[PDB]
Design a binder for these strands. Sequence first.
RNA 1: GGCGUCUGGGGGGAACGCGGGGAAGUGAAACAUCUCAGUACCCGUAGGAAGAGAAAACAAAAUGUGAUUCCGUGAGUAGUGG
RNA 2: GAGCCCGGUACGUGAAAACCCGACGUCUGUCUUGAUGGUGUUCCCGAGUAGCAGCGGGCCCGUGGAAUCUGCUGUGAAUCUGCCGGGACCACCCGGUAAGCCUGAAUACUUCCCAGUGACCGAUAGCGGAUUAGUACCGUGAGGGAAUGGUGAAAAGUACCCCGGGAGGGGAGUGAAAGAGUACCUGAAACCGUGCGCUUACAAUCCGUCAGAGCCCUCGACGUGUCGUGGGGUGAUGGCGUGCCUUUUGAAGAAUGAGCCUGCGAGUCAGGGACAUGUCGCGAGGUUAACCCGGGUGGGGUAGCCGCAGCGAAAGCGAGUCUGAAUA
Lengths: 124, 209, 62, 145
Amino acid sequence: ARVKRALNAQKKRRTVLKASKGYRGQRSRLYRKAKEQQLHSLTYAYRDRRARKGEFRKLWISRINAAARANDITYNRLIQGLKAAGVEVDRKNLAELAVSDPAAFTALVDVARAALPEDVNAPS
Amino acid sequence: TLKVDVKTPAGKTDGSVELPAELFDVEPNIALMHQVVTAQLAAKRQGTHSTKTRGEVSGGGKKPYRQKGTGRARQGSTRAPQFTGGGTVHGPKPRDYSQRTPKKMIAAALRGALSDRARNDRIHAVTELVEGQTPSTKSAKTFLGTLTENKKVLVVIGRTDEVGAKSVRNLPGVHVISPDQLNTYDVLNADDVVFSVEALNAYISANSK
Amino acid sequence: PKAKTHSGASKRFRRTGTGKIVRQKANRRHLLEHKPTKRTRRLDGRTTVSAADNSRINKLLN
Amino acid sequence: VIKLHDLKPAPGEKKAKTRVGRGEGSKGKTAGRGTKGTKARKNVPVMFEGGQMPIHMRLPKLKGFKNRFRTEYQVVNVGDINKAFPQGGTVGVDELVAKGLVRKNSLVKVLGDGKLTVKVDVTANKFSGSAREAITAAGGSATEL
RNA sequence: GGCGUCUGGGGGGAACGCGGGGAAGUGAAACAUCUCAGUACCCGUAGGAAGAGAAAACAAAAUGUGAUUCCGUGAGUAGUGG
RNA sequence: GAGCCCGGUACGUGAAAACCCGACGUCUGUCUUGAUGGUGUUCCCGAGUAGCAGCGGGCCCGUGGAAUCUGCUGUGAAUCUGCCGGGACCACCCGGUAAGCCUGAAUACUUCCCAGUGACCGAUAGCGGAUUAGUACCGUGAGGGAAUGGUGAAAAGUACCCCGGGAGGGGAGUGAAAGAGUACCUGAAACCGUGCGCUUACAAUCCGUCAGAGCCCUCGACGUGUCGUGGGGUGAUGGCGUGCCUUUUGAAGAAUGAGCCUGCGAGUCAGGGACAUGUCGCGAGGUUAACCCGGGUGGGGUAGCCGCAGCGAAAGCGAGUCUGAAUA
C-alpha cells in the first residue's frame, strides 16, 4: 500500500512553526530555520533556568549589601553575625525586608552586631 | 461425549448424534488457531502488485549531459530513483504468501474450534434444510430462525444437497461449506454451526476412522 | 537457490561426534630431513580448530 | 465463545521489525555501519583474509579417499531390543522398522551395547561378536541374511 | 542454352523451438588458464507447439527394469578447479 | 449508504447462415493364392560406415590413466564362432543389435479475442502515453521524447441596467450554495499586499533566551479604578549567548553542502537456503516434494530429508575404535 507523507510531516511542521511565533525574519516563516532556532532557544532556556537562581541571588546580595552599608556594616560581617545569632532568614527575604521594612532590617543589623565577636581578626 | 438431537424441518426431533470426545472436547489453543487462520488468510491473498524498477522503465539508456562544466549535480540517467518519473527502489513485486502449516496443526485447530462451538452447544444437526426437490428461501430462513437467533451461521451440507444449498444461499448471514472443506476460519467466523446428518456422519467417519 | 559449501574448506576440515571441527597440522609435506623426529611427531595427527577461526570455518563449512 | 477477534499470538511470539535509517532516534544516518570503508558500502567475503594466505588454503587437505563402494549399516543395540520387545519372540527387520529402531529400507546390523535378558530370535544382515554372544546367552538365536 | 506452357517461392509477426557463429564491462580484491557465458547479439529455419523418441539402453550377478519427454528427490553430493 | 426505480443477477431460453467438433454413411485401401506348429545345411541383416592416428568441441571431468558422443584431415573392416557397450586396457560373463525413416499425450509461450480477479496505483502515482502520445519538440541520421484530469444534480453557463473602447466589474437574476461564473470541488506552504495595536532615527544585534519598565486587549472580584493561585500581544533596558550537516585529532568559520516552499527520494524481496534466538504443534520420532482430488484457505501423497553410534585414508570393527610389536 502506497503511503503519502503529507499528514505526518505537516503535524510536526505545524507544531514547530507555532512554537516559533514572534521570531524575526526567516526564523518565523520557514520550517528549517525555525527548527534550528527552536534548538537554540530550548538550549538557551535550559541553561538560563539553571543560571536564574544565581542571578537572583546576586541581585539579593547586592540589595542586602547596600542596605547594610546604609546601616554602617559590611555584607560579610552582617552575614557572619546573622549566622552566629542563629537567625535563619535567607537572602531573598533579607532583601525583601531591606526594600520594604527598613526597621526590621535595622533590628536584624543590631542583633547581628550583638552576635559578632569583639575582635573579628582575632585567631579565635 | 456430547449429545446433539437431530431436528427436522417439520419441527420434531428425529434422533441423536454422538459427538466423539477427541473431535468435540479438545481444549482450544488460541495461539495455534491464530497461526492457522493467519496462514489461511495469507494463502487467500493474491500478490498481484508490481512496480517498475530503474531497469524496467522506458528510456533512460543514455547519460544525460556533461558531468563537469555544467555546475550541476552529476546524473547517470534520467530514470534514477530520485528523478520524477524514475524507477522505484524497493517496490512491491509479485509474490506468494502461502505458508506450509503442518497437517497436525490444522487438524488440531479445526478440532479446537469445533469443540469450542460444541461447548456452548452451538452445534445443531438437521436431516434436510427444506422439503426436497425445490429450493425455498422462506422455509430455510424460518427453519434457521427456529434453530438459532444468532447473526452469522455456518451450514455444512453434502455436495449432493443442491436444494438446501440453493435455499440457504441468499440469506445475508449464512455461509455454506462442504463437510470435507471444513476449516478453522469458517468455523470461528460463525456463531452457530448447522450440520446435516449425513454431513456430520461423513465428517465423523472421515476423521475418527 | 540452495547455498553452496566451500570446496577447500570441505577438503581441509572435519567434524567429530560432538560437532567439533578438526584440522590437520601443516609443515609435514617436504623438507623433512633437518626436522627431528619429535618435531614431526608433534606435527602428526589432528587437532581441534582454535576458537579464533571457529566462526569463519563454521561459516565456510555450512 | 471464541470469535475471530479473540485470536491473539502467544506472548513474545511476535517481534517488531527494526527499520534502519529512520532518524537519529533508533538508527539514523548510518544504519549501524560506522564510518566509510569496504564494509560501509557492500560487504566482505568470508573466505577473504586481507591478502594473507587464508586458513582454508594454507592447511593440508584431509588425507584419503571415499570408497564409493562402501557398504553402510543402520545399527541397533541389544538394549533397544530389550526395551522395545519385553515379551521377546521373533525379531525381523520390519519389526524394527515398525518399532522405529532403524530406517525402513536399509541394511541392519545388531550391536551389543545394552543388556539383553529376554529370549529373542533376531534375523539381520550382520552381527557384532558381543551382540551374538548376548543374543545366544539368553537362549535366543542370531541368524543373518 | 533458347522457346512455350503449368505448379510453387518471395514479405510481415510479441513470446515459445531447433541448428550454427559468438563478445566485453564483471569476479578472481592485480591478470593471461578460469568465470561472466554459450549469456548479450547475429545468421537459417519452422510449428501450434517444436525438439527427442522405440535400445548397437541402463544395471550388476537382483532367475533386475524395459521408447521418448517433463516435474520432485538424489544433491550443492560424487567429483572437477592457477 | 437501494434486494423490491433502472441496467442487471440466480435461473431458463435462442441460430437463417458460416465455421469448429463428433457419429452414421457413400468412398478408399487392404487380407483372403491362405494358415499352423517341425528337421539339417549355403546366402542376407543398411560402407568410404565402424575402428585407428593427428588437431579440436562438449560431457562433474580445464588432456589428465580419459571411457561414451561429435567436427575436419589421412588410413580404413567385418555380416552373427559378426560388431558395439559395461569410465585406460586384456580375458570371462552380461546387455544390445549402429552406419534407414515416421510417430499423438504429458511440456514452453501470448501479438490478439472473451469473462473475471486484486490487504495493486489513483494524475510528480500507475504504461512514456487517463487529456492532440510515440504527439509536440530535439537530431542530417540511427535515435531521444515530454506537459496538460474534477463547475454544477441538471447549463438552469448570469436576460436586463450601469462604468468601461474592450478586458473586467457593480446591481438584477439561475442555483441548495456564485466562500460552485466555463481563469470554475476541496484551496495548504513559499511569495506579494491592505487595515489596526505595540515598538523603532546616540545606535556595533548567530537576531534568541532569562529578568523586565511602559502601552494595548481580555477573564473574575469588589466601585466609580484596583487587585488577582489570572491569561495574552508588543516590548525600552540589563545578564548570557561562536547557525545546521558531513568529514574530522580538532571547524561558530577562513574544510564541504544547502536561495525558499510544497510534493517525490535510500537495508527490500525470492530460496523446504546457513547460523543464532523467541514462539507453536508433535515427540524417539518429526516432516512431506512432485502430483491427485476439492470454484478456497481442505483432504490425500513415504519418494526423500533431518534425528536414531562412533572410530578409521580405507578394507573394517563397533560402545568402542585408530596408531602401534604392545592391556602402552
